[PDB]
C-alpha cells in the first residue's frame, strides 16, 4: 500500500513552479476538478507568493484521490488539519461562486500571453 511520501519541491524557480502547478491543475482525473482547478489557477496562480504556491502544490498533488479534493472544496467531507489553511479557504470561496461566473469550460490559455 505505501506510495511515495509527497515531498515539497524547493529546486524550481517561481515561474517554473507556477507553470508546473498550472499543468497539474488543468490535467485532472475528473471533469469536476478539471473545471474548478483550471479556473482557480487562472485567478490565483500568477498572484500567489511562493508560500501560497507551496500550499496549493500540496493541496492538489498530495491527495491520491481527486474525489477527496473535490469533497473538501464542496465541504461535503471535512478536510484534514494539514490541508485546512488559506489556500483551502480560497478554494472553498472559489467553489461557492459569489460573483456568479461561468464554471462551464476550462479557461483558454490566452490569458497568460
Amino acid at each position: 500500500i505505501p506510495l511515495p511520501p509527497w515531498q515539497e519541491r524547493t529546486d524550481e524557480s517561481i515561474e517554473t513552479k507556477r507553470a508546473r502547478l498550472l499543468y497539474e491543475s488543468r490535467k485532472r482525473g475528473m471533469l469536476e476538478n478539471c473545471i474548478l482547478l483550471s479556473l482557480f489557477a487562472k485567478e490565483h496562480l500568477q498572484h500567489m507568493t511562493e508560500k501560497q504556491l507551496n500550499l496549493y502544490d500540496r493541496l492538489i498533488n498530495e491527495p491520491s484521490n481527486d474525489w477527496d479534493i473535490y469533497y473538501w472544496a464542496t465541504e461535503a467531507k471535512p478536510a484534514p488539519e494539514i490541508f485546512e489553511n488559506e489556500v483551502m479557504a480560497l478554494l472553498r470561496d472559489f467553489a461557492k461562486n459569489k460573483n456568479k461566473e461561468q464554471r462551464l469550460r476550462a479557461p483558454d490559455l490566452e490569458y497568460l500571453f
Binding site: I1, Y23, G29, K96
Partner: protein, 611 residues
C-alpha cells in the same frame, strides 16, 4: 537542435490507467524491465472517476454463471462484438476480481465475508430467460481509485520504471514492427526514445473530440492518433456511447439515480415527454431511448434555454430531505457548475459523450491488428488494452461495470502474451539513428507557430461541429456536411498560432499536440458514421433505422440468401488517415462470432434488438 535521450527496456506501457497499470504491474511481476509512460500521475487517470463497480459472475449473492454474463455482453454489443474476446473477458472475470482482492482492494463484503455484488441495470440470469443478476463488485464509491491505488502500489514493488508527466508522441516503427515510443518530457522539454521489444498502448478514450463529454480534458485519443500516424487502422470509431443526462455546457455526469429518485425530464412546454416516448418505463427507460427522445425534443423545437439546445431535469418537486439524503452531491454539482438550486430550479441536461467503444483493433490476447489484403495480421511488438483498444468486448454498445473489467482482464492478457512469447533481457531491437525525427519536427513546428487561428479557436470549432453533426442525431446530409467541415478544420491545422515558445512546462504545446490527436480521431469518427448506413447499438441513423445483418434475423435464417460482406453492415469499420492530406480511407473486417471453444461456451447467434 534537440538532443535525444534513449532508454532501453523489455517492454513499455503508455498509460497509467486501470489497463496500463495492470499491464505494467503484470510485466514487472513476470520479471521484465518495464517502463510506464504517462502524461499524468497514475491516480489522475480517468479511471479514478469510476465510482461504480466491476462485473463478474462470482455468485456471492445468487447462483450465477459467467456464460450468462457472456450472453448479456454479446446481446448488449448488438452482435458487433467479437465473441471470442467476450468469452475471454467474462470467463476471466471471477479470477480477476479475486486476484484484485488478494492484491489488496478493499472490496465491500457481505455478512459472511463474501464480496458483495450489486444489481447494475442490464444484467440477467439463465441466458436472459429471467431474473436480475448481481455481478457488480464495488469498493464503496471509490472503485476506480482503489484500482489505481492498488495496481500502482504493487507495480512500484517490482521496480516499474515510471515516466510520470511524459507525453508520448509517436510509435517507433521499423519495417512494420513497433520498437518503442518516442515521448516528450513535459517538465524540461527533452525528447526521449523509450526503446522496447513490446509496446502496450492504454491511453484511454477520445471523448474530447466533442464539446460535451463526461471525461476530463485529458481524453484526447493520443494512442489512437499514434496508431493512425503509423499507418495502422482504427476500429469502430463512429460508435460513441452517450450518457443521457449530462449538465449542459460543462458535460458533468448526472447519475441516473436522479431519475430513479423521482427526477423527470421536461421540455420547453412543461411536458414530461418521456410519458409519450416510453409510457412503460417513462424517464427510467433505456439510455438510448432517453437520449434519442431528448434529441428529438430539441430538434422538433421544444429545446430549453436562450438557444433552445437542451432540456430540463426537474428535481424540485421532491422534498428537500430526499434531495439531500437520497441524492448526495447532486445539489453541489448543479449549483457549482450550472448555478442551479435544485430545490427550486431544474438542471439543464443534454446527451453527453461518456465512453468510446472504438479504438485500436486487437485480438483477445491484446495484440494490435492490421488489415492486409482482406486478412487480419498481428503487428509485432504492439499491444493495446482498455478504452483505447477495440477487442471488441463492447461492440456497438458498452454495458455498465464492464469497462473496469475490460481494463484488468486485457491489461493482464497483454502481459501474459508478452511473457508467453518473449523472455526478459531479450535483444532490444535496433532503430535508425534518426528514428522519430518526424515527431520532433512536428513538435518544433507547433512550438514556433504564428498563424491566424489560435489553438483554442480551432479546438472549439472542431468540438462544435462534432457536437452538431456526429452526436445523437445522425442523418445523411448532416453527416456529410460535418465531414466537409471537419476536413476543412484539418486543413486549417496549418494556420495554428501558439504563444509559449519555451520548453519548461509548455502546457500550450501539450494541448496543441492533443488538438492534432483530436482532429485525427474526429475525422475517422465522422467519416465512419456517415458511411455506416444502418442502426446498431449507439449508432442510430434516421435515414437507416434498421440493423443490417448478413441475414434478416426477424425471419427464419435458412430460406434466405445470405447477403455478401460488401452489402450488410454486421462488420467492423477500419479507418485510415493520410496525415499529409487528411484523406480518410475506410475498410471493413468481419465480426468474430466463434468463441474460444464451442464445447465450453456456445456462440450466441444474432437476434433483433429488444429494448
Amino acid at each position: 537542435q534537440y538532443p535525444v535521450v534513449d532508454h532501453e527496456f523489455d517492454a513499455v506501457v503508455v498509460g497509467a490507467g486501470g489497463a496500463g497499470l495492470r499491464a505494467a504491474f503484470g510485466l514487472s511481476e513476470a520479471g521484465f524491465n518495464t517502463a510506464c509512460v504517462t502524461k499524468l500521475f497514475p491516480t489522475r487517470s480517468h479511471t479514478v472517476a469510476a465510482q461504480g463497480g466491476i462485473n463478474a459472475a462470482l455468485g456471492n449473492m445468487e447462483e450465477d454463471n459467467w456464460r450468462w454474463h457472456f450472453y448479456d455482453t454479446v446481446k448488449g454489443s448488438d452482435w458487433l462484438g467479437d465473441q471470442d474476446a467476450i468469452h475471454y473477458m467474462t470467463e476471466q472475470a471471477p479470477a480477476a476480481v479475486v486476484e484484485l482482492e488478494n492484491y489488496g482492494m478493499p472490496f465491500s463484503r457481505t455478512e459472511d465475508g463474501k464480496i458483495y455484488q450489486r444489481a447494475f441495470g442490464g444484467q440477467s440470469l439463465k441466458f436472459g430467460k429471467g431474473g436480475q443478476a448481481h455481478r457488480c463488485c464495488c469498493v464503496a464509491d471509490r472503485t476506480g481509485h482503489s484500482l489505481l491505488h492498488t495496481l500502482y502500489g504493487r507495480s512500484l514493488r517490482y521496480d516499474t520504471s515510471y515516466f510520470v508527466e511524459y507525453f508520448a508522441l509517436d510509435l517507433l516503427m521499423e519495417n512494420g514492427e513497433c520498437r518503442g515510443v518516442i515521448a516528450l518530457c513535459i517538465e524540461d522539454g527533452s525528447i526521449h526514445r523509450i526503446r522496447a521489444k513490446n509496446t502496450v498502448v492504454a491511453t484511454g478514450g477520445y471523448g474530447r473530440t466533442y464539446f460535451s463529454c463526461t471525461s476530463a480534458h485529458t481524453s484526447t485519443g493520443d494512442g489512437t492518433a499514434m496508431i493512425t500516424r503509423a499507418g495502422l487502422p482504427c476500429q469502430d470509431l463512429e460508435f460513441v456511447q452517450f450518457h443521457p443526462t449530462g449538465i449542459y455546457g460543462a458535460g458533468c455526469l448526472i447519475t441516473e439515480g436522479c431519475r430513479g429518485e423521482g427526477g423527470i425530464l421536461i421540455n420547453s412546454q412543461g411536458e414530461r415527454f418521456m410519458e409519450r416516448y416510453a409510457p412503460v418505463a417513462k424517464d427510467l427507460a433505456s439510455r438510448d431511448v432517453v437520449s434519442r427522445s431528448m434529441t428529438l425534443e430539441i430538434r422538433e423545437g421544444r429545446g430549453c434555454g436562450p438557444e433552445k439546445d437542451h432540456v430540463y431535469l426537474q428535481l424540485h418537486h421532491l422534498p428537500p430531505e430526499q434531495l439531500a439524503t437520497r441524492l448526495p452531491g447532486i445539489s453541489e454539482t448543479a449549483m457549482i457548475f450550472a448555478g442551479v438550486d435544485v430545490t427550486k430550479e431544474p438542471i439543464p441536461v443534454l446527451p453527453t459523450v461518456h465512453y468510446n467503444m472504438g479504438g485500436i483493433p486487437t485480438n483477445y490476447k491484446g495484440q494490435v491488428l492490421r488489415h492486409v489484403n482482406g486478412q487480419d495480421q498481428i503487428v509485432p511488438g504492439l499491444y493495446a488494452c482498455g478504452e483505447a483498444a477495440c477487442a471488441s468486448v463492447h461492440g456497438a454498445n458498452r454495458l455498465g461495470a464492464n469497462s473496469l473489467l475490460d481494463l484488468v482482464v486485457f491489461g493482464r492478457a497483454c502481459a501474459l502474451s508478452i511473457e508467453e512469447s518473449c523472455r526478459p533481457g531479450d535483444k532490444v531491437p535496433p532503430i535508425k539513428p534518426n528514428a522519430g525525427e518526424e515527431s520532433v519536427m512536428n513538435l518544433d513546428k507547433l512550438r514556433f507557430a504564428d498563424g491566424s487561428i489560435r489553438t483554442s479557436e480551432l479546438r472549439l470549432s472542431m468540438q462544435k461541429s462534432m457536437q452538431n453533426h456526429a452526436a445523437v442525431f445522425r442523418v445523411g446530409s448532416v453527416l456529410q456536411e460535418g465531414c466537409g467541415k471537419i476536413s476543412k478544420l484539418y486543413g486549417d491545422l496549418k494556420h495554428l498560432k501558439t504563444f509559449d515558445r519555451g520548453m519548461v512546462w509548455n502546457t500550450d504545446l501539450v494541448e496543441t499536440l492533443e488538438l492534432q490527436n483530436l482532429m485525427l480521431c474526429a475525422l475517422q469518427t465522422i467519416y465512419g458514421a456517415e458511411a455506416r448506413k444502418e442502426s446498431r447499438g449507439a449508432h442510430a441513423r434516421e435515414d437507416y433505422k434498421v440493423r443490417i445483418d448478413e441475414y434478416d434475423y426477424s425471419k427464419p435464417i435458412q430460406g434466405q440468401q445470405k447477403k455478401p460482406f460488401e452489402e450488410h453492415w454486421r462488420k467492423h469499420t477500419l479507418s485510415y488517415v493520410d496525415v499529409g492530406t487528411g484523406k480518410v480511407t475506410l475498410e471493413y473486417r468481419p465480426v468474430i462470432d466463434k468463441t474460444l471453444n464451442e464445447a465450453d461456451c456456445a456462440t450466441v447467434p444474432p437476434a433483433i434488438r429488444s429494448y
